[PDB]
């Protein structure tokens, strides 16, 4: 189980410094490249740079794209590998990836899930989460629609999983909308059996990582 | 850099048919161009590397060939889940660049929309908002039109709707619109109604309750 | 490792 993560996202202010950290497992990290590749929301793919193995030191490569405001860095005692980007603009907001190299398979061979970073001088707010509770104006052919409003957020995104991840068919999380207050709004909806409304316990889980929010929901 | 143009920027194609992308470079790059699958919201994944060597896993249902300066992907037999967009990557020389890449979408049979109405929670009416949602699940085409009505007079400007993306096992989509009042807007009317018009419809569908 | 040629 070769697996890389990118730190989670969040907000960065304009000219500041972005940084991210891509921690692997389930290989001999240490005897890859790792890349980083960005792709600006609606956008798409940049590669940043990569950062070499032990071999080499762990010398780098960037794009000249970047030039002179990215440093890649591995702490090995850690099982980390780091990005950092100084003086931000609009332009450097996007979802982060990091990308190991591979080596028969190369370049790009595993991918982190990756991790939006969005620059902006405002403020981070968590969000409200409702219930959409199944009901006779929600029945179709022995089937039922429930869900969870996830209101006034910011930035994006916002995760939600639906029984800490045991329910995934069925589940429709829309893409969030922009609202007038420059705040997001989403709604995660599942159709389910009627029949077994009396016995299943449906949760939402709403994690907005920008804010640390955490917010579980039970919708009856 | 090296510059890499793709073709066609997006298609769409029924289940079983063969779709072929091109990848032009703007100067040779002898056989190192690899293939990357992206599904919205999810990293790209490695399906061919060095023209046409599939990663380990991939069906064999898709391919790549070419040399130089031109490029073709091949999926021989489109499938359901393979809807997504497609990058061409070279790495002969630095910096690494991408295509701009190709969306590949499904055309299937028309799929009518299964629709919900929910009234506003009484946690979210306790905080002085009210906000009435409108589920269009599972439909095709992805063009719909929702009408929010309260007491028959048609609404406008106030509310908010987002479309999925294409579904990878039916290849259907789904709608969500939101409608929001104050409270007090709220409580100054009777039925909500939310009516949807689609083409798998033989007539509009109405979903609604009375306050 | 990398067969990649662009990764030295």
Same mark, same amino acid.
């Given at each position: 189980?070769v697996?890389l ?6 907000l960065?202010?304009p000219?500041?410094? @972005? ?14 490249? %790792?890349?980083?590749?960005r792709?600006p929301?609606?956008r798409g !793919?940049?590669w940043i740079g ?11 490569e960037?794009?000249?794209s970047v030039?002179?405001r990215?440093? %890649? !860095?591995?702490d090995?005692?850690?099982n980390?590998?780091?990005l950092?980007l100084?003086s ?5 907001t996007?979802?982060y990836?990091?990308?190991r190299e591979?080596?028969?398979?190369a370049?790009f061979?595993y991918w982190?899930?990756?991790? !939006?970073?969005?620059?902006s001088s405002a403020?981070?707010?968590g969000?409200s989460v ?7 104006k929600?029945?179709?052919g022995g089937?039922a629609? @429930?869900?969870?409003?996830?209101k006034?957020?910011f930035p994006?995104?916002?995760?939600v999983?639906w029984?800490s991840?045991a329910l ?8 969030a909308?922009?609202?007038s ?6 709604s995660?909806?599942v ?5 077994? !409304?009396g016995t299943?316990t ?19 | 850099?090296?510059?890499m143009?793709?073709?066609p920027?997006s298609?769409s ?7 072929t992308?091109?990848c032009?470079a703007?100067?040779?790059?002898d056989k190192?161009l690899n ?5 919205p ?7 061919i590397?060095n023209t ?11 391919s790549?060939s ?8 091949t ?7 393979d809807?997504?967009?497609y990058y061409c ?6 910096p ?9 979408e499904?055309?299937?049979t ?8 929910f ?6 009416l ?11 699940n599972?439909?095709?085409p992805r ?13 406008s ?6 479309v ?5 096992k039916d290849?259907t989509?789904?709608?969500?619109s939101t409608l929001?009042?104050?409270k007090?807007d709220?409580?100054?009317?009777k039925?909500?109604a ?18 | 490792?990398? *067969? *990649?040629? *662009?990764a030295d």
């Amino acid at each position: 189980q070769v697996q890389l993560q990118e730190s989670g996202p969040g907000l960065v202010r304009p000219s500041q410094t @972005l940084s991210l950290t891509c921690t692997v497992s389930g290989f001999t990290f240490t005897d890859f490249y %790792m890349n980083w590749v960005r792709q600006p929301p609606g956008r798409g !793919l940049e590669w940043i740079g990569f950062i070499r193995d032990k071999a080499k030191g762990y010398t780098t490569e960037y794009n000249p794209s970047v030039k002179g405001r990215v440093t %890649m !860095l591995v702490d090995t005692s850690k099982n980390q590998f780091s990005l950092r980007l100084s003086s931000v603009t609009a332009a450097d907001t996007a979802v982060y990836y990091c990308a190991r190299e591979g080596h028969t398979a190369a370049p790009f061979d595993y991918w982190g899930q990756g991790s !939006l970073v969005t620059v902006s001088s405002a403020s981070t707010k968590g969000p409200s989460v409702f219930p959409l509770a199944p009901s006779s104006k929600s029945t179709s052919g022995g089937t039922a629609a @429930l869900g969870c409003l996830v209101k006034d957020y910011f930035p994006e995104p916002v995760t939600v999983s639906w029984n800490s991840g045991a329910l995934t068919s069925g589940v429709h999380t829309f893409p969030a909308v922009l609202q007038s207050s420059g705040l997001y709004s989403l709604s995660s909806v599942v159709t389910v059996p009627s029949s077994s !409304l009396g016995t299943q316990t449906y949760i939402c889980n709403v994690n907005h990582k920008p804010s640390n929010t955490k917010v579980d929901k039970k919708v009856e | 850099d090296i510059q890499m143009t793709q073709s066609p920027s997006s298609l769409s194609a029924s289940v079983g048919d063969r779709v072929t992308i091109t990848c032009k470079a703007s100067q040779n790059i002898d056989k190192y161009l690899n293939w990357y699958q992206q599904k919205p919201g999810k990293a790209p994944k490695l399906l061919i590397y060095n023209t046409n060597n599939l990663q380990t896993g991939v069906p064999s249902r898709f391919s790549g060939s070419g040399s130089g300066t031109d490029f073709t992907f091949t999926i021989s037999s489109l499938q359901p889940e393979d809807i997504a967009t497609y990058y061409c990557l070279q790495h002969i020389s630095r910096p690494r660049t991408f295509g701009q890449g190709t969306k590949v979408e499904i055309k299937r049979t028309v799929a009518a929309p299964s629709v919900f109405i929910f009234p506003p929670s009484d946690e979210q009416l306790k905080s002085g908002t009210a906000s009435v949602v409108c589920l269009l699940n599972n439909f095709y085409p992805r063009e719909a039109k929702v009408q929010w009505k309260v007491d028959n007079a048609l609404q406008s400007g106030n509310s908010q709707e987002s479309v999925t993306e294409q579904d990878s096992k039916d290849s259907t989509y789904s709608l969500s619109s939101t409608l929001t009042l104050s409270k007090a807007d709220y409580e100054k009317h009777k039925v909500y109604a939310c009516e949807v018009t689609h083409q798998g419809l033989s007539s509009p569908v109405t979903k609604s309750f009375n306050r | 490792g990398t *067969s *990649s040629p *662009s990764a030295d």
